[PDB]
Amino acid sequence: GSSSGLPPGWEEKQDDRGRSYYVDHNSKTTTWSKPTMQD
Numbered sequence: 001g002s003s004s005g006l007p008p009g010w011e012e013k014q015d016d017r018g019r020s021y022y023v024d025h026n027s028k029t030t031t032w033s034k035p036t037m038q039d
Contacts, residue, residue, distance in 0.1 A: 007035035 006012050009026035023030045 003010075007037045010035045 011023045012020050013023055014020040021032055024033060
Protein backbone atom coordinates (compact mmCIF):
# COMPACT_ATOMS: atom_id res chain seq x y z
CA GLY A 1 0.00 0.00 0.00
CA SER A 2 0.99 3.62 -0.61
CA SER A 3 1.09 4.48 3.12
CA SER A 4 1.31 8.01 4.56
CA GLY A 5 4.40 7.77 6.75
CA LEU A 6 8.15 7.28 6.50
CA PRO A 7 9.47 4.54 4.12
CA PRO A 8 9.07 0.86 5.12
CA GLY A 9 11.33 0.25 8.09
CA TRP A 10 12.28 3.88 8.62
CA GLU A 11 11.19 6.70 10.90
CA GLU A 12 12.49 10.30 11.05
CA LYS A 13 13.21 12.24 14.25
CA GLN A 14 14.87 15.65 14.53
CA ASP A 15 17.39 16.65 17.21
CA ASP A 16 16.90 19.51 19.68
CA ARG A 17 18.30 21.94 17.10
CA GLY A 18 16.15 20.90 14.15
CA ARG A 19 18.21 18.50 12.07
CA SER A 20 16.40 15.28 11.31
CA TYR A 21 18.15 11.94 11.73
CA TYR A 22 16.60 8.60 10.88
CA VAL A 23 15.88 5.70 13.16
CA ASP A 24 16.19 2.61 11.04
CA HIS A 25 13.97 -0.31 11.99
CA ASN A 26 15.63 -2.38 9.28
CA SER A 27 19.00 -2.68 11.05
CA LYS A 28 17.79 -0.98 14.24
CA THR A 29 20.04 2.07 14.43
CA THR A 30 19.70 5.82 14.86
CA THR A 31 21.95 7.29 12.19
CA TRP A 32 21.99 9.37 9.02
CA SER A 33 21.06 7.05 6.17
CA LYS A 34 18.91 7.29 3.08
CA PRO A 35 15.76 5.13 3.14
CA THR A 36 15.60 1.68 1.55
CA MET A 37 13.12 3.19 -0.88
CA GLN A 38 14.98 6.28 -2.01
CA ASP A 39 12.24 8.57 -3.30
